[model samples]
Target: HWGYGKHNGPEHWHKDFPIAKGERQSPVDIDTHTAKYDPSLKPLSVSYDQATSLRILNNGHAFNVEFDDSQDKAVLKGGPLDGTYRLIQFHFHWGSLDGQGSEHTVDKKKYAAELHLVHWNTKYGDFGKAVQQPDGLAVLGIFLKVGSAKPGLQKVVDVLDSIKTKGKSADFTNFDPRGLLPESLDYWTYPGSLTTPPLLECVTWIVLKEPISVSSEQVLKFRKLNFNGEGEPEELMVDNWRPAQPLKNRQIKASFK
Candidate 1:
């Protein structure tokens, strides 16, 4: 029921998912002036095993590239995290044609797209159990700006045709998550919840300041994905992102000034 359009949009989510009105809701607007700088923040240490890449799926909301977290195949550390976190899945959020679709914006400026790399703390056993605790999840947000075509993203876009319909999944392997990130690791971090429901308050948001470039054609390719499955009325799956929420009493810290 929670989606980007009217009636079932974000504004109406609090009715079914009460946590939507919680203090630590995600997708907050980032104002650099208000964010404090911390020299103590360590660099992000990420290790992803290419073999662990399982497949990519269109889950009606967005295209999710899932990873095998059974072992330490993909582990994250040293970035506002207490212990090792395992990579579970990564997804993108976009909008109509060239409109503002990114969930988290800097100084209220929206990007062409946004990528979310989700990870769960290994201490809680599994994502299902960890999501219940405050320090259970860590999400890396990378903004996408329109520019020259990103050759690196072509591998992912090339397979979009196979998983156009909702619930469709295609074999996706030998993919490295590091290639998707930018060179500079400068970031802004805060405690927030997942952008979608149940909108649990378990995420430690680490948003990178440097945005990667993508072509306009690449952005349009993502819009071709459908929100329905085979034999179902087709609805373009775009603008699948929640609006920025209130920061409330939260404090955003920057790894660099």
Candidate 2:
């Protein structure tokens, strides 16, 4: 299995999933100087319904809050998307220490953690089908810095103990994801991949310019999660992020000047 281990980590992923080396691979280092500013780019419109949130689970990789995506209750539009994308789930990627964790970087700077709100284009029916198309998914990436404890994130941290191992899940509903976003909607848009296994090149990444804040202690709670199952010898889930890939023939467009 592919993991962030010494032998089976990202460097060895390309052997099993060939597309890991694809041109549009995600988590690129966003060079502010080189990213072109596009005046035509509209502001990102994100509307998340609290009731759509269902549960939070540890899927061996990362813990994610799943949503009821049967309809368009929570969605993302405008910005770089051509159509409405339904919010399916939201998850986080963090590090063992506070210095690094985020998959994408700004001017080569790393944050303590990164939050991904994954959505699928409704035009393609479901996420399974959407993942195969070029413009089928829109993932909103928010950087998390170590500072004061975020009130919005406290609710999630409280539930971490319930899902400390792989395949564990608990009821988590009516949580508004909007509380996790930054004050500004300004972002950089680009064509990228899933940043995980299968590494599909089907995402339109919208990385927010401003980052949210969480205390250093809050970040440590995430590290307590186990990559291994309950019975197996526990291996802490840290550094569960893919490194930035090369930016080939792709142009990064900033929504602000």
Candidate 3:
């Protein structure tokens, strides 16, 4: 368990994920002035046609859907992160209640939560092998916030009833993730690390600034998640939000604003 936002808050995760020290970590105070805006980098094109073998896992933090790169189409580009990345998994990081803490903050503002669409460069090999390469992985960072609507996410929410209980998972039978992307693909790209344990710093982050909105009720429902069930008060899933970490010497390039 990566200790949600309770006893072991952001200050404590560093004992294990030291790489968090270098990557552009989460929970940034989202302020337009805090981050220097760049208007060149654009949202990379993606097709979930490559994602398959979807299986969900409630690993204490949030519900994560794992995919087989052997079956996904997550691709990459030519650069320090150049390679063909396969979609490995997708997950969420939310607060104990709606209108609260989220992982990737934009300009110093924290959204309701963030959805990470993770992928590994298959150009180097499988998950075990690619993660070792300098340009082996890329994670599409989607900012999830409590707003008016979420056109792309309703599909998943429609099925939330099926997996309401923690540790609950389903095949989801035939699912396509491209449907999950927001209308805008505009994103910020930077070199970063894994948001969880075994902290890998090989990620090229694609963080979307324009948040994808979810209803207040939906956001509230997600915050109630208790990896074990709804009864445990100690395991309240707030603080799934990682504290902002040092950006190191990295440059964050963003899509045209």
Candidate 4:
């Protein structure tokens, strides 16, 4: 079983999952000074249906709010993407402490946390099949900074108590993910992979430059959730983010200069 523990953390991931060392691994540090601003990239188009939100679960890794992706009710397009990608679920990665939790960094600067909106290219038929293709997935990475309280995030935090253990889930509906996004949609685009195990090199990363605000009190709540399930030795689920990987023959493009 792979986890963020000292024995099975990111350093040991490549031993089990060889693709972890493959080209285009995700959560790469965005060197803003060198990233090219591509005029060809279009503004991102994002739409969501509140009704599509189904439930929130503690999957032993991160608490993900799963969506009903049976249809195209929630989709992301444009902005370095050729076709439509359906939104599947969204989750977060955070550190135990406030200073460093985000997976992706800006000029090597870490934020309090990071949110990933996972989407699959509709052409691939389904997420399982999409994960194998190079252009099969598109993940929108949003940085979370400690400042003001985010009402949209509060709803998610309110339900954390019910899912304190692994495999626990509760109905989470009527949540619009758009409220979680920052005012500016400007982003840095690149080819990357899933930051977690089975690190598939299939994701097209669209990382937003502007970070959304979350109170320090709210962030501390995330640390309460355990990596262990009920009856197991309780272990705090923190530092659940992979460090930035080597860039390796990749060029990052910016939607804004």
Clashing pairs for predicted structure model 1, backbone only: none
List residue ranges in candidate 3 displaced over 4 A.
22-43, 72-81, 161-166, 229-234
Score every model by TM-score: 0.97, 0.98, 0.83, 0.98
Task: Assess candidate 2 and give its TM-score to the true structure.
Answer: 0.98
Ten consecutive residues with minimal summed lDDT in candidate 2?
Answer: 42-51
Query: What are the per-residue Cα lDDT tens digits for candidate 1 across 70-157?
Result: 9888888887988989999999999885658799999999888999999999999999998999999999999999898887788899
Query: Runs in model 2 with CA error above 4 Å?
Result: none
Candidate 1 wrongly placed segments (more than 4 Å): 49-51
Query: Model 4, range 197-221, lDDT digits (tens) per residue?
Result: 8999999999999999999889999
Q: Give model 1's clash tally.
A: 0
CA-RMSD of model 1? 1.1
Lowest lDDT sum, 10 consecutive residues, model 4, at 42-51
Please identify which of the two predictions, 1 or 3, would achieve the higher TM-score against the true structure. 1
Give the per-residue lDDT digits (tens) of candidate 3, residues 1-257. 45654556666676776755654543343344434456544336676665564677555667777776664455544332454567878878877656556666665666677888878876766888766765667888787777776765665666555565576787754567776678777666777667776567667877776677788777766655565564555455555767567665656665644
Comparing 3 and 4 on lDDT, the stronger one: 4
Cα miss at 199, model 3 (Å)? 1.8
Q: Count the backbone clashes (under 3 Å) in each candidate.
A: 0, 0, 11, 0
Q: What is the C-alpha RMSD of each candidate to the true structure, in Å?
A: 1.1, 0.8, 3.2, 0.8
lDDT of 2: 0.93
